[PDB]
Design a protein around this nucleic acid. Structure first.
Ligand SMILES: Nc1ncnc2c1ncn2[C@@H]1O[C@H](COP(=O)(O)OP(=O)(O)O)[C@@H](O)[C@H]1O
Ligand code: ALF
Ligand SMILES: [Mg+2]
Length: 439
DNA sequence: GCCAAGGGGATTACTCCCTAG
DNA sequence: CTAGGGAGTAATCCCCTTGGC
């Protein structure tokens, strides 16, 4: 391993470094599709550290990541390779306008004496600042959570496709997503000459370009997830709403509006129309009634717990209930500013006092480590099993020591069931499409 | 002057059904 | 007669104008 590293790569990660090095030295690009929590970051960083250590390329190295991952990757690269001067390219336009003063355009290869070596950037900024970005030449590009790039009609695909870069990685734990075209977009991006626009063939052609190990094999020290399915019925208020709403199917089947209204009442009828008493507010949502009994048991267990919502208005209502109860919580959603994210995550991870993290599906589902929680609760299931898997794999990562449990509140006899059954069967489709070897 | 808010808008996600190849 | 791409909607996040001390 490159001597720049602070902490030793594990056996499978060293094999992963070797694959990434061979991809580079053979002049080709590939996807590190290693499962969640296997340590894609240390392998990818060790590539950059090898380009530095072996070929004296001290960048310019680009990291693109989701906004909640940015502080995590800045910290971890500082941990694993302190020699790399990070440029944390995020901020307001005026703050970014100052940070551009560190971009040396004269050197196409930076040396250790350089204003920066690794630049870490949001998927948002490579698009908004694209006009600045495409005027620079990158010696290696890493893309975290490459499922962000899965749509070829997305501006972030079109923009990053056109970046002048020698070699590129896609990092993901969930490559397949919804369709073969979404897989192609990841394959075209890495190797545009080969993949310009049956499973026996697929697993043969992709073998050089994707590497994927799984926790069942390499990380079996961590116990399996305990998934639990927690059915509850529509309380009398909810079914009065749901049935009078379903009466619109005397005309329809607007249906795409109705399925969002049906999801709202399955979360809490106050989302549809607010009432009043907090005792009624608990019992007039069946999910919240079953959750209250569950949190009551989990607290006596000492089970620090992550609650995932598909709605923002629900995570508001949720902390009204958490302030009616005695429960100490913290919160993270797509509106919390990035320094607020860093501090809340670090706060939760530091002090065991906090019981609940009210955590968003998307903004709270990727990149970050939450190993001091042990329980994950989906208040809402999601249409994409990869997203719910990403959310639940925030615990159950290489730092975990407690057993992990995953609960899922499903309102029986509602579209909450169709959503979960449709998302669940896609996991089998995605598993079948990964029937071949990933090694 | 300095911080706050939020509010607006463009991008991205994913189902459902129209319409044309 | 199938598929493509438009309609709906809500989360995500940068910009920026208003307001207060
Ligand atoms: N060789 C290693 N030594 C120590 N810690 C590691 C190693 N590899 C991974 N980790 C730890 O694994 C945790 C999660 O890994 P990470 O790479 O963030 O997962 P992902 O593959 O989703 O990015 C991190 O806290 C990181 O410190
Ligand atoms: F694949 Al990750 F945090 F980067 F689960
Ligand atoms: Mg990662």
């Amino acid at each position: 391993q490159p001597k720049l590293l602070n902490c030793q790569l594990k056996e499978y990660q060293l094999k992963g470094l070797n694959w990434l090095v061979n991809l580079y030295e053979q002049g080709i690009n590939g996807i590190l599709a290693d499962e969640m929590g296997l340590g894609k970051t240390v392998q990818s960083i060790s590539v950059m550290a090898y380009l530095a250590e072996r070929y004296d390329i001290w960048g310019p190295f680009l990291v693109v990541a989701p906004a909640s991952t940015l502080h995590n990757w800045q910290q971890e690269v500082s941990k694993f390779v302190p020699d790399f001067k990070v440029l944390p390219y995020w901020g307001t336009a005026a703050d970014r306008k100052v940070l551009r003063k560190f971009w040396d355009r004269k050197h196409t290869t930076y040396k250790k004496d350089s204003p920066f070596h690794v630049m870490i950037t949001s998927y948002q900024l490579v698009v908004s600042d694209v006009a600045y970005f495409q005027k620079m030449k990158w010696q290696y590009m890493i893309l975290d959570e490459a499922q962000a790039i899965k749509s070829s009609q997305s501006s972030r695909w079109k923009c990053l496709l056109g970046f002048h870069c020698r070699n590129r990685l896609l990092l993901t734990g969930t490559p397949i997503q919804n369709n073969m075209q979404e897989l192609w977009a990841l394959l075209h991006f890495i190797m545009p000459s080969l993949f310009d626009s049956q499973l026996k063939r697929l697993h043969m052609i992709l073998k050089p370009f994707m590497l994927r190990r799984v926790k069942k094999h390499v990380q079996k020290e961590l116990g399996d997830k305990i998934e639990i399915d927690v059915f509850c019925e529509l309380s009398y208020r909810q079914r009065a709403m749901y049935q009078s709403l379903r009466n619109q199917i005397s005309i329809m089947d607007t249906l795409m509006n109705l399925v969002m209204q049906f999801r709202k009442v399955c979360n809490h009828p106050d989302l549809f129309e607010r009432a009043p008493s907090m005792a009624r507010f608990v019992t007039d949502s069946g999910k919240l009634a079953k959750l209250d009994e569950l949190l009551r048991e989990l607290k006596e267990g000492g089970h620090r717990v992550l609650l995932y919502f598909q709605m923002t208005r629900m995570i508001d209502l949720m902390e009204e209930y958490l302030t009616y109860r005695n429960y100490k919580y913290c919160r993270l959603d797509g509106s919390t500013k990035l320094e607020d994210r860093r501090d809340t995550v670090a706060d939760f991870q530091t002090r065991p006092e906090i019981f609940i993290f009210l955590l968003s599906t998307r903004a709270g589902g990727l990149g970050i480590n939450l190993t001091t929680a042990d329980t994950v609760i989906f208040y809402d299931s999601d249409w994409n099993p990869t997203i719910d898997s990403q959310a639940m794999d925030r615990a159950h990562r290489l730092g975990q020591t407690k057993q992990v449990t995953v609960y899922r509140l499903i309102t029986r006899g509602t579209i909450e069931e169709r959503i979960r059954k449709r998302a669940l069967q896609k996991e089998e489709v995605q598993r079948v499409v990964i029937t071949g070897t990933g090694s």
